[PDB]
Amino acid sequence: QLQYTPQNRSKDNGRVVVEGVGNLMHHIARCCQPIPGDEIVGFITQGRGISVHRADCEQLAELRSHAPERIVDAVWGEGYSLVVRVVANDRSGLLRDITTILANEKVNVLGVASRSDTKQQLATIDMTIEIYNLQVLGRVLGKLNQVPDVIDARRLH
Amino acid sequence: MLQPKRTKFRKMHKGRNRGLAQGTDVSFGSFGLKAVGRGRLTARQIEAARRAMTRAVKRQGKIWIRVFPDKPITEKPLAVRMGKGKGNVEYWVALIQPGKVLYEMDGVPEELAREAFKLAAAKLPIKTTFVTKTVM
Amino acid sequence: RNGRDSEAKRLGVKRFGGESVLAGSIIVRQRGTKFHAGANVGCGRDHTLFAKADGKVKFEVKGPKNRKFISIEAE
RNA sequence: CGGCCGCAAGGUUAAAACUCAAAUGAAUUGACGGGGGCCCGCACAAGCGGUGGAGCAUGUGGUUUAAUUCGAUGCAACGCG
RNA sequence: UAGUCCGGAUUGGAGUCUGCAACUCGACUCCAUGAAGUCGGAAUCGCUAGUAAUCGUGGAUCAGAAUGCCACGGUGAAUAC
RNA sequence: AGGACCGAACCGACUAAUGUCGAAAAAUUAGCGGAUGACUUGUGGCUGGGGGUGAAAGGCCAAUCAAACCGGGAGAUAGCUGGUUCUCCCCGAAAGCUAUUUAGGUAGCGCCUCGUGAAUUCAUCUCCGGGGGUAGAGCACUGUUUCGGCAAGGGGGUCAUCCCGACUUACCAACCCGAUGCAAACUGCGAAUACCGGAGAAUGUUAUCACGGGAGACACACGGCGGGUGCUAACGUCCGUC
RNA sequence: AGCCAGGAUGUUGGCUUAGAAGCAGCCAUCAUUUAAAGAAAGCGUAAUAGCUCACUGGUCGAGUCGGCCUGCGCGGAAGA
RNA sequence: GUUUAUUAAAAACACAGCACUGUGCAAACACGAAAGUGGACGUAUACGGUGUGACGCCUGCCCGGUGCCGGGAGGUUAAU
RNA sequence: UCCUCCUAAAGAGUAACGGAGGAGCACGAAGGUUGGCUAAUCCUGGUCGGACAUCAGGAGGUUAGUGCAAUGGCAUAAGCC
RNA sequence: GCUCAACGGAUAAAAGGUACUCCGGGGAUAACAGGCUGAUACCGCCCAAGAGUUCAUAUCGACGGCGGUGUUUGGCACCUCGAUGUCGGCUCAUCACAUCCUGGGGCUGAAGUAGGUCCCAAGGGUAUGGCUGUUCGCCAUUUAAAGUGGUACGCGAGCUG
RNA sequence: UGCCUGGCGGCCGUAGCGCGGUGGUCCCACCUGACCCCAUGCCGAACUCAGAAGUGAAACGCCGUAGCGCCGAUGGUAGUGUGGGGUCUCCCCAUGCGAGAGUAGGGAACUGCCAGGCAA
RNA sequence: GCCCGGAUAGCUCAGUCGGUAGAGCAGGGGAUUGAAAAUCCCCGUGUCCUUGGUUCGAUUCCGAGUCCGGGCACCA
RNA sequence: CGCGGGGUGGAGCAGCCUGGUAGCUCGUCGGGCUCAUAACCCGAAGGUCGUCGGUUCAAAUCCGGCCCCCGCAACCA
RNA sequence: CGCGGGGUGGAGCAGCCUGGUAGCUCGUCGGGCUCAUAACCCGAAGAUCGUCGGUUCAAAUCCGGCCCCCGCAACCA
């Protein structure tokens, strides 16, 4: 029910400075989820301007095998938006266990990417978010690797 | 609750259980749990044992069930007079005769396996034993 | 909702190998054609293999597809 | 409520608590009436040609947008400022 | 008498003029392209005279940018008991 | 005045106890209701058995009533029960099948007996000739099953996004391939026993078959074996077989 | 099998973590004086410290250790 | 008041009252093969049937089904 | 009532309110015969035509068909003209 | 010419009630008790993820497993059709112990008080009413406690009805 | 008398597939033409016919190869009739029969008759 | 006097486990009106009793001080 | 435990019975009349037919299970 | 099983009776008129006669078989 504001505010920009200049139309790609820290590598799509693909990655490398010349460099100016996989044992209110932590833990909860099937007692749950502060990322990983049903809860890439 | 996905005939004849097992060599994991007794494994017991054993090995190494219920044991609702047709497919079981492998496992220290099977077998009805894939 | 059933048709072999019979004698009451005619062995519509001549009885396996046959040994 | 009368329906006698600053009579000017009379106007009737269907122009609502500046929005806004 | 030599939208190409500038966003030209539409539901509009209707001419605004507005004559009814 | 009132005789009969092989085949005792009335009683009439009568309970009609009593059809009928009387001798069942307004009866057949009559007729074994598809087995087929390999196609994606199309996935995954089990209604296999047929020896008071007189029997129980059912429960139940 | 004593340190291993210094957690599984000592089997401290540990040598001194296979038993095992 | 004499006295029955409906007198109905009688030596303010059951306030909607009454044209219609 | 499969213990038969499905017809042709032919289903290519009409080829092999349920059977075909 | 389909076909042609009932049979065939059985019900036992702030096993313990009893709900018709007259109350009880109290212990996440729990132990003790026919149950008020069961769910040739 | 090849069998996957090679004098195939015999629910593709230049590709046959299919012991196991036993929801024993599967191995047929060709 | 607990945006309420202060209602905001309602689009909203100390995180630890709901106890 | 009936646009009902193609009423939506609303007038969309599986060339329909809903039964005990 | 009647435009349905040559109302459409519908009024819109043969110059007709329906009646195999 809580599932625009980012694209309306990423338009506020200042978030990327491409080869010495910002203000260029751009967007973080869905195949890397670039994070503020370890810079990036940018590619120029025909329309929709620059397509950042996070520094070092295959699809970005595939482009190198087509029009590598178009590819460009940039930084971050000023950890919004990312996904996290939390494959875990069964559930038993575990869906609450993720959320229980997340609640007033603050961070955005638009990553309704769960998938409970497999063969064994191991539901595959994923979560895209739009966490703000980089420090917040760390507290989550410590508070989410802990969970008993959880066997893995870290930066999906 | 391991069980057949879309059968052929619904209810099945009781059928006496006799003779020895078949797949008697742990042909997958390095270690397995052979069965000595001669009883029937309810789908519940099997799966329950699976979770039992899996609890120990965390999730490292690898497992393999060697059986499968596939025999629709039927009961009759309580307080009903005999006859009037065979009852209802209450639950499924796999006939198990002496010497039948059940849970092959590997990738984990032999000791951890030897400990897990203690538990899994502990939940099983039929008396069982541990085994290792002796070459050929 | 069941319990219904036909009424056995007394099928199966009626004459075994080595047996002697008269023409018109019925050797087999097969429903399909588990067998096939042989020398002196007529095949009625009911696939009731029978004797076309008095004599002995035998069960050949001749034929490329190992189909069994019945033949009246001309005894 | 009680009392009396009544077969009944009810009737007769007849309060209070509470509640508002009005309720009300007539008469006046208007407005209105699916009241009456008298009269007019493309009001209708009698006709001529139209929009509404079609594509396009233009304005408008709505929607969208980072902005779709602001105002106009029964008749008397909508090729309007 | 056909969607037809009707229709002209849309669209490609190639141009002209204005103006620092014509992609968003102009006008106009040429070649081609060539849709909806075969008189429009409910509903509803103007109009009695040189009006309706139909026809083209012009002007302010204006660098440019009218199918709008304003203005001008041409043609020219019906009907009102 | 009154189907008025309290109330004895009178009429009735609510309650309790006693009695309940009694004092009695419905009463005594203690109390009960009616008691001028649709009351009660004498005597004597009348109404009759599918009839009477009934303030209606199927109550009453001679201690009897959802059709009285007595006698007569009449030894009703009784697939039901009980019972069925002296003796010895010989043989000796079945509790199955099929059919039945049949299922605790009966009928024909199976088994029984007595009689006449017939062939190594028959049984046992060894040997020979036979079909089988069961136990077991197996997984080519029908289904089902686990893992692995390959993997279309399905989704996520990057790029493109009109469109084609190109890579990409620690995502789902058909098919075929390799290993792996399961089946009463699966079989590319397949016993023993079982059954039929042929021959030969041994032993068997013909043990065999046919015809004939008379039956009984058709409720079966248990135990082992092979199963169905049921909970691989029942001295359970339903068959085969001994 | 007992008892005497050693069981350290380089060092706070680095990262981590308000500290985690021998043991929350990833890595390590290097070397040192080596009789031996791993970046610790169990305990314990805010971290420390600290009691043990595997282990190493002393004394005595003969067997000793756990699995395996099976024979027969014990518990498991309460009724009117 | 009555009631199951001999397990039931009641809330059962009857009950006065109300309604329905039958019946014009050789009544209706019943007893009876019948004659004949009760009805009644009465005649609609009467007599039989039925439902209800003093009194008080009342007693609503349904004619499809069934039955009862009325209509008789038309189809169907027996012996003849 | 009748048919088919299993139970049914490799001959026949064999019970249960045991397990599973059917029939109470159809056809003058779907019968008889003579001659002839033999499929399913995927892959590829192909006007409209697309997961799938028809077509060509191939692999495949009777996984098809047999008026209807099942079983046995069927290419010498009983299958199809 | 028959769904004579109950399909070997009693008729050309036929549905009910009987607690007003009646007769001849059966424990061949039921209700209740018993008997076998123990699915179910009850009690106990194994494994033990987990809860228990730390720590599985102080105390509970899921997923599962094996039992034991013969109290329940049942299954089977072996006993009884020539009468087993069914629940509760009353009266009178007797046994088991899987113990409600009292007595003796261990452990306790037991300071003490008071409890939790398991082991031993059957000597004795082990309510009065309200409502309901109830047993039971809820409730009132007690008590050291107001046990669980068997005994034809004891007890009618003793009572009540 | 040896090799070819064709027809017809016996037998019927030890005989069948795949792979590699190979033959055209004859034989065979394909092949050529089709007024006519006959034929196509269209079509000489098939069928049918008249023929024969061409060829050995296809097909066919032979030869080699075992990558499979296929065959297949011995032993053991399962089962099992019969007689005993137990811990009798299953098995033990004596005992006669005795698998399926799998292994060693086998293995790319043999064969009779006739007819024509070559070599004798 | 001692012992035990309640205090959270304006109202009612969530919480919290020594770690980065929310839900609901009103309320305000914008459209519209003269201002409301209806309708339409937005939203905030708290010294966690105070306070220091253990506080990088105390709001969950700790009393000291507050009121608040129970309980015992001074019966001169 | 039992037998019978039903689940279809947002609501109520068809249509199923007897295989191919789902209609009615209100409601929702678009326009009109009105100062405005309703009413009224014009025009329009909207239903994977409970779910799964099956039978079939094809299933809302035929067949079976599952979940729901209602009915009738649960007597002698 | 026989007999008595009968399928006519889409159709309720006359014609028949007394051979050639076929009506009605509902189907729809439009105009009309319509505060706006309403209502109401006119023409158009409409089968070679239930199926196929005989006799006839010509077959609804007059008749034979024929499907379907409608009644009686033989429903004692």
CSV table of N, CA and C (backbone and C1' of nucleotides) in Angstrom, one decimal, chain G residues 7 13 18 34 45-46 66 74-75:
chain,number,residue,atom,x,y,z
G,7,G,P,53.4,-21.3,33.4
G,7,G,O5',52.5,-21.6,32.1
G,7,G,C5',53.1,-21.7,30.8
G,7,G,C4',52.4,-22.7,29.9
G,7,G,C3',50.9,-22.4,29.6
G,7,G,O3',50.8,-21.5,28.5
G,7,G,C1',51.2,-24.7,30.3
G,13,G,P,46.0,-9.4,20.5
G,13,G,O5',46.6,-9.7,19.1
G,13,G,C5',48.0,-9.4,18.8
G,13,G,C4',48.2,-9.4,17.3
G,13,G,C3',47.3,-8.5,16.5
G,13,G,O3',47.9,-7.2,16.4
G,13,G,C1',47.1,-10.6,15.6
G,18,A,P,30.5,0.2,19.6
G,18,A,O5',31.7,0.7,20.6
G,18,A,C5',32.4,2.0,20.4
G,18,A,C4',32.9,2.5,21.7
G,18,A,C3',33.6,1.6,22.7
G,18,A,O3',34.9,1.2,22.3
G,18,A,C1',32.3,3.2,23.9
G,34,U,P,65.6,-21.9,22.6
G,34,U,O5',64.4,-22.9,22.9
G,34,U,C5',63.4,-23.2,21.8
G,34,U,C4',62.1,-23.7,22.4
G,34,U,C3',62.1,-25.1,22.8
G,34,U,O3',62.7,-25.4,24.1
G,34,U,C1',60.0,-24.4,21.7
G,45,U,P,31.5,-12.8,34.3
G,45,U,O5',32.7,-11.8,34.3
G,45,U,C5',33.1,-11.0,35.5
G,45,U,C4',34.2,-10.1,35.2
G,45,U,C3',34.0,-9.0,34.1
G,45,U,O3',33.3,-7.9,34.6
G,45,U,C1',36.0,-10.0,33.6
G,46,A,P,31.9,-7.4,33.9
G,46,A,O5',32.4,-6.3,32.7
G,46,A,C5',31.4,-5.9,31.7
G,46,A,C4',32.1,-5.0,30.7
G,46,A,C3',33.5,-5.4,30.2
G,46,A,O3',33.4,-6.3,29.2
G,46,A,C1',33.5,-3.0,30.8
G,66,G,P,37.8,-46.7,26.9
G,66,G,O5',36.9,-46.6,25.6
G,66,G,C5',36.6,-45.3,24.9
G,66,G,C4',36.5,-45.6,23.4
G,66,G,C3',35.4,-46.5,23.0
G,66,G,O3',34.2,-45.7,22.9
G,66,G,C1',37.4,-47.0,21.8
G,74,C,P,16.2,-59.7,33.1
G,74,C,O5',17.0,-58.4,33.5
G,74,C,C5',17.6,-58.3,34.8
G,74,C,C4',17.9,-56.8,35.0
G,74,C,C3',16.7,-55.9,34.7
G,74,C,O3',15.7,-55.8,35.7
G,74,C,C1',18.8,-55.0,33.8
G,75,G,P,14.2,-55.4,35.4
G,75,G,O5',14.3,-53.8,35.1
G,75,G,C5',14.8,-53.0,36.1
G,75,G,C4',15.1,-51.6,35.6
G,75,G,C3',13.9,-50.9,34.9
G,75,G,O3',13.1,-50.3,35.9
G,75,G,C1',15.7,-50.7,33.5
